């Protein structure tokens, strides 16, 4: 919480970028810390078709390291840097921990049922295929068909690195902000 401490010192933001981020952050939550409710209020504005509160809950849990209850500016900025301008390894670990709802690191097709369910539910009901009750399960099943060999973190890393398409989609936003 200094401005120079979170400079290009394992944080991928410059001084001006840090200043802009702090101005925007304190504009919404002047207290310097943002909680789950306000997290959802900002997140739901970008996706007005449906409700993103279900996904914003898991997103906040991923952001809120150590389950403090409210996420401050320092860890918020380091999470943003890891996700946007971070390396492959950090991004993949962050996504794995986002999917990993419980404490220990495991994925069992029920922990991430809610993740895909929220990703589909944050679109409302206005899409062309009119969705379906079983389409998130189909998406999860086809997802497990490319990494789950027998029944982990190493598997997730190697599966992501094997296919170049997710590789080139992860780095979409590092060039522009």
């Amino acid at each position: 919480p200094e401005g120079l401490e979170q400079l290009e010192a394992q944080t991928n933001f410059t001084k001006r970028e840090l200043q802009v981020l702090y101005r925007g952050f304190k504009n919404e939550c002047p207290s310097g810390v943002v909680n789950e409710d306000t997290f959802k209020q900002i997140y739901a504005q970008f996706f007005p078709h449906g409700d993103a509160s279900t996904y914003a809950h898991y997103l906040f849990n991923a952001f809120d390291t150590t389950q403090t209850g409210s996420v401050k500016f320092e860890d918020f900025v380091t999470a943003l840097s890891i996700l946007l301008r971070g390396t492959v390894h950090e991004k993949l670990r962050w996504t794995f921990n986002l999917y990993d709802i419980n404490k220990d690191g495991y994925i069992n097709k029920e922990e991430m049922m809610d993740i895909v369910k929220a990703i589909y539910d944050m679109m409302g009901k206005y899409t062309y295929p009119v969705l379906k009750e079983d389409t998130p399960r189909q998406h999860v099943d086809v997802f497990f068909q490319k990494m789950d060999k027998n029944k982990t973190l190493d598997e997730f890393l190697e599966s992501c690195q094997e296919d170049d398409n997710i590789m080139r989609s992860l780095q979409l936003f590092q060039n522009v902000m």
Partner: protein, 209 residues
């Protein structure tokens, strides 16, 4: 929405979670262009705000191509000829999103600035909106009493309306007399009298006392 625009890197970082469970289609990022604070000189008092702050509400005067009408180029600033102590609440709206009502400002002048700058009395915050509605109601009652059409507290209102009409008639008579004096023997007065002369001499008729 555009109100939370400084959280766009937040939304982009959140979108990273979709990539593992996606099928990368090359979604073609827009590749934007790339932020100095701009000056809004509302009759002497300068107000400095970032352009991105104004652009987040692109349906009003300040966030628009409309403010290019009020750009004064050689000083590199936007000069508005409005109230300096009410444009403050316009900027406060542009920063947060909720208008505030000054308890000490006339509501007929507060509404004038809202109409000028494109804001509407529907977006004023709930914190000060009962009093805004109450004062608007009092102003509307004053207008209705003043416009009851009695041609043939309300008594003094009718008296001041008659006095105002008498003053308007006196001003018209004074303008006519000034034109007459000019014909017998300011800047805008010369052009106005030229227009009156044109009206006279297009119908071969002359104004007399």
């Amino acid at each position: 929405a555009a109100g939370v625009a400084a959280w766009l890197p937040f939304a982009r970082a959140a979108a990273i979670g979709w990539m593992p469970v996606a099928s990368g289609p090359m979604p073609a990022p827009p590749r934007q262009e790339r932020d100095a604070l701009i000056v809004l000189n509302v009759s002497g008092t300068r107000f400095q705000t970032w352009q991105d702050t104004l652009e987040r509400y692109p349906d009003t005067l300040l966030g628009s191509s409309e403010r290019d009408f009020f750009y004064h180029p050689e000083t590199q600033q936007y000069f508005f000829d409005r109230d300096p102590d009410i444009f403050r609440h316009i900027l406060n709206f542009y920063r947060t999103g909720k208008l505030h009502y000054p308890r000490h400002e006339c509501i007929s002048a507060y509404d004038e600035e809202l109409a000028f700058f494109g804001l509407i009395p529907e977006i004023i915050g709930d914190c000060c909106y009962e009093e805004y509605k109450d004062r608007r109601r009092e102003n509307a009652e004053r207008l209705q009493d003043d416009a009851d059409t009695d041609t043939a507290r309300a008594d003094k209102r009718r008296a001041q309306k008659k006095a105002r009409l008498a003053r308007i008639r006196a001003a018209k008579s004074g303008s006519a007399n000034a034109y007459m004096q000019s014909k017998r023997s300011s800047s805008f007065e010369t052009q106005h009298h030229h227009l009156l002369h044109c009206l006279e001499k297009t119908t071969n008729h002359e104004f007399v006392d």
